[PDB]
Design a protein around this nucleic acid. Sequence first.
RNA 1: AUAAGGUGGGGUUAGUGA
Lengths: 1335, 307
Amino acid sequence: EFDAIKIALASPDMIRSWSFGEVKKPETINYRTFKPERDGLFCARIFGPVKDYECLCGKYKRLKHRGVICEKCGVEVTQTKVRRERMGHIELASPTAHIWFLKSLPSRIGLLLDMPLRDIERVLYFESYVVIEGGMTNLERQQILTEEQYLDALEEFGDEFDAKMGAEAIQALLKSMDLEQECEQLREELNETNSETKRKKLTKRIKLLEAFVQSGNKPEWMILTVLPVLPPDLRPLVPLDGGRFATSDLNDLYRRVINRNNRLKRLLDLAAPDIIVRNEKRMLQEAVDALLDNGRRGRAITGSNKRPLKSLADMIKGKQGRFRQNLLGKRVDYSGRSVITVGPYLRLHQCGLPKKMALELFKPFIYGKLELRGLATTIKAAKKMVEREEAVVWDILDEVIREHPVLLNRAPTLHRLGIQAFEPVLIEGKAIQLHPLVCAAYNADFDGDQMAVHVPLTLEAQLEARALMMSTNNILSPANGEPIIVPSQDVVLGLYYMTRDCVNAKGEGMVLTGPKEAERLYRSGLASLHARVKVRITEYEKDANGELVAKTSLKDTTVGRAILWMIVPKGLPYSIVNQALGKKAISKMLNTCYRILGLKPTVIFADQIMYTGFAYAARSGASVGIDDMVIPEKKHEIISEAEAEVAEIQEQFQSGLVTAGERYNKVIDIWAAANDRVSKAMMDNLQTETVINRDGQEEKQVSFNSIYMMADSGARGSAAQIRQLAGMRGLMAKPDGSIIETPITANFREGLNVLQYFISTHGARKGLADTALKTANSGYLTRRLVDVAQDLVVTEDDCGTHEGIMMTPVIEGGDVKEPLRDRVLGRVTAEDVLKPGTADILVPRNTLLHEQWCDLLEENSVDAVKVRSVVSCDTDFGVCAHCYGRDLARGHIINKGEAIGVIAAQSIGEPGTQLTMRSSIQVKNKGSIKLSNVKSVVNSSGKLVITSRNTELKLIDEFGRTKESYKVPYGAVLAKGDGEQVAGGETVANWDPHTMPVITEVSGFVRFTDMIDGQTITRQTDELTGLSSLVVLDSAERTAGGKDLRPALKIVDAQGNDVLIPGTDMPAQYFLPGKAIVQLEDGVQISSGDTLARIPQGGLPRVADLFEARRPKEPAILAEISGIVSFGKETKGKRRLVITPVDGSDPYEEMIPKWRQLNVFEGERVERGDVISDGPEAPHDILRLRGVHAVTRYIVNEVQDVYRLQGVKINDKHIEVIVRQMLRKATIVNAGSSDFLEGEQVEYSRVKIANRELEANGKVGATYSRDLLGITKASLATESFISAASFQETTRVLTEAAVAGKRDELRGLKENVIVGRLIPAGTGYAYHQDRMRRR
Amino acid sequence: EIGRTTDPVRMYMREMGTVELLTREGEIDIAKRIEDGINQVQCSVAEYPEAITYLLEQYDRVEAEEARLSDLITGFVDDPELAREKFAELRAQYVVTRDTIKATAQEEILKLSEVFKQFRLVPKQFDYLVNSMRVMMDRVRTQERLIMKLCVEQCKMPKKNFITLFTGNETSDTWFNAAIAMNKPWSEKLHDVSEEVHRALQKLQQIEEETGLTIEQVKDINRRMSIGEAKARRAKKEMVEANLRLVISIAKKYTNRGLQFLDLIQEGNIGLMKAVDKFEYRRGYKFSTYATWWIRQAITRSIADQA
RNA sequence: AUAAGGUGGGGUUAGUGA
Ligand SMILES: [Mg+2]
Ligand SMILES: [Zn+2]
Ligand SMILES: [Zn+2]
């Protein structure tokens, strides 16, 4: 029916076109009778039939009279629906400014005129005059006048010269403005002002002008004259219980505004003095804006309860304006809600449902089939049949819920598994029964969680339910390929109890031919369950073309392993069950079952292991007891020696031999050590306490204590929690955030004292309070970045490109903390895998890497693969599938259509709750030594020192892969060198953190050049040795008389010649900064690598500040461009630099906060994007200097370290893709044959097709520069204004787009749900292939 | 340092604080000026003959009872029978003045204005006469714009030659035949619009024939009336500007009856305007006591129907 | 199908173990 949404500012006669009348009287209803009046608010003859096809007086009572108006009041007969939308106007007397354009900050009126807003406010509230059309005066056409200086003007140019006040003057002055002279003139003044302030203000000026004329508006419409009134039924008058009436605010202030207007009219009739009508016009001004946006004016207004009433502006904004309140989230029919419970006897493709809720939810279906069978003809018969509960209907809703799916919902619906579908089985009773394996996916414990259900009505949605929403579909997480239908807690207890063995039992080590006999031995009770017996089993495998082959042997095993072997389907190896089967082993068991045997055997296998899980768990009889928790007997003695040790350090403080913090730290360390002694004390006491005979004397084995099974199997808890049970619990923190010196010596099996418990409840309250406010922030994070992505749809097959990023296994600096094969798994490569067989192609360039390929290059020890990423996908308005890869819940390629931006958003969002709250180089393992960006020199001692900070120490193994990474300091004494072999566990470096060395590289003399004692340096003898040294000060301590003098230690030989820099023909001067202590005196001939001077010295919102992309506290300063450097002018707010590039010019220099201890030196020649000092590495310059791939790789390494610190998995594509939504905008560097302004921001896709088809022309396109934006304002910088209108600051984007005249073809999602059509993501992507294909 | 005082009350105090309180004898001084204003416009009313024609005709509407006994008169100074001797006697004065029109004519116009000056009327008749001379100035003004438009904007007549000889007579051909007799080239262009100016000036001669006066004399009547009227309005504005402290002082009482404050102060301003309209100083009371009633009328009226 | 229904305030429920 209709395309794009267009807005514009409102013309006056447009508003006259909208109305059907003028409101004139401030009443609304009778109150005496109950009638609506002639031309009040609730009007009939303006707004229409309050009754239905009937007049007010009831003149035309039938449907026959339809078409003619009445005459006793004059109302047209139509439906009563028509009073919902017929608008009305009011004609105000004196004009009135619209405050959105007045106080959007920046004001459109304000910078449109370029007069300060304070003066406009002085004109508006009548305390000042201002002159239109100055002309022949000594006084300008836009000058404000005070009233005594208007008395002055009243004297002198009190002639034909004119000056007015208020919104009349604003309409007049703003009306008489010519626009084109402003355009050309301000383009000219943009050509004049060298100041970037004036260039900025004038370019905003020229933006609003040249956009203002370009849209078909008029300036003078911005002063409101004819106010539209809202249709009456949307501002309804309801009664409360009794004769009173719950008012609306809107009706109240409409009453106020037309009372105001009419009184002003009669005052103009009576010719009152200017004081009165002045005051009244000011009252009308506050009246009108009090209608528009109450509260943005300096004091709001209240009607009753002294509580500020609601205008129209807050009716849109905020948590209950229409966008988030009634447009994205609506209340729905056909729903029910109650409390969940289990009922484990269900299969997982079905759920329980109560008979009452079923008989309520499906009532129209009952009507339909009940009409079909003819048990009752007419409808109201069926009404009383479904009311009175006759026995036939239980057959009927028994029938119609045969294959009709339903949906379930749990309220904190974080990630998309919170909605799954089931097939209802009717239940006696009235709670909802639920299959157990769904609970972990819902995170819904049975502590009293309620769930809600829904019913898809139509046919296609039933197919969407069974097709996609059905719970058998989703078994893998969208976050990662791990199964989410892992058994939760007690079935793993049962199976862990199944596959175990005490060392001597009934039927110890007999033989058996097949697991059925083992079942007969168990249920006959002739052998124990945990008892080992060599049996015969037989298995299958599909090595061939999926071909299953029988083969068999006599495995030695337990009984119970052979028992649950019967449940396993055909294609498995045996040794999947030949162990104790912890939670991890059964999890990857199910995983490989999915990888090898497809879908359905994994499904029915999972149900069956649930059944035997509860069977043998119940038959097991796993209790707990007070006698089960065992106190280690050594606990008392370890605590005893510990308190002796704090008595020893304490008496060191009694006579004061030690300080406070030293006693503090030693005491807290020995409590840490003794605490650990108690920890492995109780572990060694528990884990293997069972010592028994075995047809012989004695033997130890693992413990049958209930706790150790419950923690060992992975059911609940860990060594930490049982550590808090048996052994002592912890060292609790203090409210300061520091740590208390006396640990909680007791444990929960014994009694805590008073104060240990008191300290503990401090820690607990601080904990769950943090959970409350942390939840509050995490929801806001997801709420934000779901909006900034929102729109990215996999829409094409293959971009056909060769760009992308380079995946490597990451190393923290110690162990590999994330290998290669998971960062690579399931992402199609960029180029082909050259095998490290030299010139062999292992894997071709466009292949999916499933597990076989990953094993293939896994064997050949490939270290790096360039891969296709979504940041490099060349697709306009989308992403090709061959740049994205796998579904991660559907084990294949991604299909065409899946809007993966939101699953990225939920995917990073759901761990937001579970985030946490509260030298030298020593190698470990053995390999070859590798260094990179090395600028080294052999010292006098045979060691190695490196004068480049950017050198990195790596450990290549004996195969070729890197296994360690270490920073090489500027001038660190290395014990070894590059390409060398070391042994694991060897120190290979040395430096001082308490010395920045000013070391050398050559041999010769060092002369005291410019080391003048008192201006640059100072005489500071060493009071400990006697070797006095001339200490070089910094700028702020030395006086200005020799501050421009740079003390240098320049390398000369025995002849004094410039010992040049090795390689070039520049002298080797060592300019001396602050805290540089020149120990080696004058005339001292130096060695290599010797210090000529010595210079000594996070949580969730970290992540939110990374996608916020903030400038950090001080940025690490970096090199804009390659070339040499020097220094700049002394202390000008800061001391400056001077940078001199080699080949091109040297436009770049900068004041530097000299708290930044510099890293580079003057003779150093560097590359762009390289460090000058260090600190936090600001992202914008990584974009603008090191490029696109660098900044993305920086981001994903950063936040991947954050989540990976907590051990919370997320595959890397999601961070990639929302970054591609971050850096979508760009700016212009040159137009070329483009038509854009150079100083203009535009999205990169639109300029990419712009020059891309200017490339189709002979002409050159444009040159661009990309930007990254914080997501909370990147979403505001979007072409679809409704999308930003659903986000924050609705007023700002609404006015700005409103004066823009901007158009919106909707090309996206939440606007397509905001308008109510097919979403263009899933099936509606095929529908928009259709509607796109027509036009 | 005007501290963006977004309360309109605050700045409203800043304006009303300019005028200080007047004593009660200054009210005698100002209401004296008011009596000057209405009395002088009653003099200019008395100097209008068609007021006396329409007066006697409306008296025939009174005794014909095509009007009412209280729709023409509001008592006199120094019962339709008094109106029979007064308007029958005034009919005799009107015919004895009307006979002698062919000097002493204008003396009998003066004495007719004096026997009429005793008379007091219902103010709708005052509306009739103000609008009567008002429309009279609109027709005169129309001929001013017409002959100015055609002679100046058509014949290139200098406005110095227009205002000096033309303005004041406006019905003769003395500016016409004498200005064309000045032998100027604009004056020879005055032959171009002699029809529209002179023949449309014939209705203006008809205006002087209807009123029995020249345009200049009528301009003295209604213009001098306008001087007295503007003077009286200056007095009334001045008194209101005195009594604003009264109206806020009484406005403190009825505040929280479900309405805002400045609504009350404006309604009370209306009420004191009406009280100015209905006060007399020769009564001998202080103004405020009489004013109080009109203020409570405005307030209780306004909150009463604005519940 | 005649139980309907705005605005404030208060109380409660469900939402980690490293
Ligand atoms: Mg719960
Ligand atoms: Zn009617
Ligand atoms: Zn692509």
